[PDB]
Paper text:
KEAP1 promotes the ubiquitin-dependent degradation of NRF2 by assembling into a CUL3-dependent ubiquitin ligase complex. Oxidative and electrophilic stress inhibit KEAP1 allowing NRF2 to accumulate for the transactivation of stress response genes.
To date there are no structures of the KEAP1-CUL3 interaction nor binding data to show the contributions of different domains to their binding affinity. We determined a crystal structure of the BTB and 3-box domains of human KEAP1 in complex with the CUL3 N-terminal domain that showed a heterotetrameric assembly with 2:2 stoichiometry. To support the structural data, we developed a versatile TR-FRET-based assay system to profile the binding of BTB-domain-containing proteins to CUL3 and determine the contribution of distinct protein features, revealing the importance of the CUL3 N-terminal extension for high affinity binding. We further provide direct evidence that the investigational drug CDDO does not disrupt the KEAP1-CUL3 interaction, even at high concentrations, but reduces the affinity of KEAP1-CUL3 binding.
Author numbering:
A (entry chain B), D (entry chain B): 26 to 330, 339 to 381
B (entry chain A), C (entry chain A): 51 to 204
């Protein structure tokens, strides 16, 4: 009879609210599970499911949303993370009580299970409400920007917040990508851009390359301790794009510091560090080769125009040394050096 | 650099544990199965093996509710006949069922969720089919919860 | 009139139980393994599964002595390295051993009696024989207790 | 070093005595097991084994034997059974502490294990001391004799005492056979003998047979509730020997009550009960046949020396009736009846 079904629901609604109140200690698991079992058994899973969504939504909007909104300007991440752990804790016990519905009904009606429904209501009503959405985005981005400038920030609050955005993606990163990754990569591209303008403006090519490796490493260690492992590749590409790709021809041709200069003074290591950095990006090694072809050809025509042969053997040996010790015997570099030698040795 | 396995061991260990139960020794739980007609029963058993067997038990004693450390708590599902046959499975991987009670046994597996011992009834019943008794059979399959024979219902 | 069995179940159940341990949840025992060099270790675990595994444990917690209901009692056998590798066996039917510690591991199996996991070392060592290192090997077999390789000692 | 071995033994001796004193509550299992393990590990299992036998023997002779001897005339079986349960209880814990010796040393030296040694010392020093041996034999036999005479006795004290004699046989019945079964069967054969003299002296053959079945059943129910199942066959054979075998020709030829008389008045059931009883013993059915041949042949010659044919058909039909309804269509009886008919039908 339907009126006792209402009594079952009253027992479950009261119980759920006591769990949301963290007063699960003193609730008989068996009676709540058995009653929920009986409701679903008589095909009232639809009534039970609607009730669950209502009570959970009611709880997260009237209490949790307000608590989070009140901490916006005073320890925001601690309270939001606190609300997330309290939500997960309550939902586990709640998912246990409705286990029978979770195995028969949600399977039949292509609907999200109790735990995922709890994540969706939390994601949509809390994490992505709006004022909260914007404040969490500003905070996390503000922290990464302070740390990059030399400040010390709470990496754990970021790890807990990013992990939350990942889970709310429902075995996906949609929430994390839209809310965090996209703006993070945007503001990072701009930070690395102004950083490159300054570094290009003062430092030598060698120092610029060392600072690019240092920035790459700094962002990877940041991903390992704060962000999601899946963000490692996108951030490095942005670092690679803004500091290298967009200044490729500028770096190799840097006046009194570039590639040709390193070639002139036999700075073997500096050329190797340049190779290591430019091999990361497309057309990086192509630029290095075009620069090298111009220098090697210019050197060769001036050399061909006992001392002459030792000069040519030292130039060949010098560039073979450069190829093995610095260019990792690169297929592209071996073909270029050979092709250049085949041009000036054939000219006269 | 090595790494070994002993397939005979989960079985053997499981025997030793049954024997530990049947001596009504080392148990951490006691169940007062109580249902309308039948008189209340007390079953001494190990919490940890019950959880191994059923998820409804894993969660019962779990981080969940007031069954956190009870030592003694009721169950009001079916006749303790089936909770016995069931525990027999939970400690031996085997269950002796009857041409009659298999309804109550299966509904048992269903309620505390033992999908192994439920699918073994799923295939138990296919054997002695009756076009006479087929009616009530399909009634079970739709009532039961899992429309798993309701389709296979010819 | 029926009777079923599920061979996949002792294994599966045993997994669920490991997981129940590794959550340091539902445990009835805690072991403070303490030996001369190494610092004392605490291992939360289930009494009932330990007894399933070893007879020295079956009797430890048994009708025997003051280990009747302790919740916490010491062991002063070997480095808790081996009590870990051992408990890993007692909950998984498998034991990852090393080309070095297998002496200490085996002497472990020997002391609390796990004749399965001892005979697996009996046959572990036959592999990488040394006529150089054979001497100490036979020294173990006679010292050990079980002259089980002492004969097979070529 | 040997002096610490003496300290290990002192710890074990004190512990064992505390267990014998039932003060096992407060003994650290691990330390006693580990120390015993270390003693055996350094090949002192021989020293440990001798000590165990000494302490156990010392305990059962100076305390247990005296306690049992003091209860000889006042509730003997209760105290003896009490000493046996206390012995088994102590020895379990004692066998657990010396488990390592039990798996390596006793295996190497072909000696009885801790538990069996405990049984042997108990069997030889207590159950079979002498005054105790004789008093337990008299008591159990005195009880069976009172019960057979109509008295009500404690069957449980007998079951516990007989089970003990079985276990002390060390997975054999030697102790139970020598100490109990042999004298029991002796005194029973004499009781059934005087019982047969009286029953033969008053009662009819039918009543005698019913009382033999009743005695057989009474002794079987006694074996099921008091004795060992392996004693069922020997006691029935004694009952069968004294009441049936030794009086076979007497019973069938009992004047005005025997087989020929039952044959004369067509007491079908009485002949069937006689068959059921005599088929138990060798030559039983042979005696029944010799008696029947004498009667059937005597009847047939007097019949052969419309009414004559109906008389012969009723005699043939009567004995075919006797064969199917009473003699279970016995191969021996069918051949005898046929052979007898083949004798008197061929005579003239």
């Amino acid at each position: 009879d339907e009126k006792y079904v209402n009594s079952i629901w009253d027992l479950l609604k009261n119980a759920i609210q006591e769990i949301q109140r963290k007063n699960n200690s003193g609730l008989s698991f068996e009676e709540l599970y058995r009653n929920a079992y009986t409701m679903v058994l008589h095909k009232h899973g639809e009534k039970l499911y609607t009730g669950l969504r209502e009570v959970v939504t009611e709880h997260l909007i009237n209490k949790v949303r307000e608590d989070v909104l009140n901490s916006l300007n005073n320890n925001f991440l601690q309270t939001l993370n606190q609300a997330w752990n309290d939500h997960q804790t309550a939902m586990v016990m709640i998912r246990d009580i409705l286990m029978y519905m979770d195995r028969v009904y949600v399977q039949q009606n292509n609907v999200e299970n109790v735990y995922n429904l709890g994540l969706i209501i939390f994601r949509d009503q809390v994490v992505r409400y709006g004022c909260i959405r914007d404040h969490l985005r500003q905070t996390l981005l503000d922290m990464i920007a302070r740390e990059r400038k030399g400040e010390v920030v709470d990496r754990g609050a970021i790890r807990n917040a990013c992990q939350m955005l990942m889970i709310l993606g429902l075995e996906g990163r949609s929430v994390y990508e839209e809310d965090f990754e996209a703006p993070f990569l945007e503001m990072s591209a701009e930070f690395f851009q102004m950083e490159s303008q300054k570094f290009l403006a003062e430092n030598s090519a060698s120092v610029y390359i060392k600072k690019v490796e240092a920035r790459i490493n700094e962002e990877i260690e940041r991903v390992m301790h704060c962000l999601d492992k899946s963000t490692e590749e996108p951030i490095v590409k942005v670092v690679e794009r803004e500091l290298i790709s967009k200044h490729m021809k500028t770096i190799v041709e840097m006046e009194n510091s570039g590639l040709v200069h390193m070639l002139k003074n036999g700075k073997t290591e500096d050329l190797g560090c340049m190779y290591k950095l430019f091999s990361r990006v497309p057309n990086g090694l192509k630029t290095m080769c075009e620069c090298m072809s111009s220098y090697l050809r210019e050197q060769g025509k001036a050399l061909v125009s006992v001392d002459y042969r030792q000069g040519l053997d030292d130039l060949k040996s010098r560039f073979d040394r450069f190829l093995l010790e610095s260019f990792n015997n690169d297929r592209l570099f071996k073909q270029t050096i050979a092709g250049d030698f085949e041009y000036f040795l054939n000219l006269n | 650099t090595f790494s070994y396995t002993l397939e005979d061991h989960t079985k053997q260990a499981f025997g030793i544990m049954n024997e530990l139960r049947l001596s009504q020794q080392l148990c951490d739980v006691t169940l007062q199965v109580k249902y309308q007609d039948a008189p209340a029963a007390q079953f001494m058993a190990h919490k940890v093996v019950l959880a191994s067997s059923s998820p409804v038990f894993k969660a019962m004693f779990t981080n969940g509710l007031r069954e956190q450390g009870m030592e003694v708590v009721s169950i009001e599902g079916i006749h303790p006949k089936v909770m016995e046959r069931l525990i027999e499975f939970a400690y031996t991987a085997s269950i002796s069922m009857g041409e009659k009670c298999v309804l109550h046994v299966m509904n048992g597996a269903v309620m505390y969720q033992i999908d192994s011992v439920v699918r073994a009834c799923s295939d138990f019943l296919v054997q002695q089919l009756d076009p006479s008794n087929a009616i009530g059979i399909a009634n079970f399959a739709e009532q039961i919860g899992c429309v798993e024979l309701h389709q296979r219902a010819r």
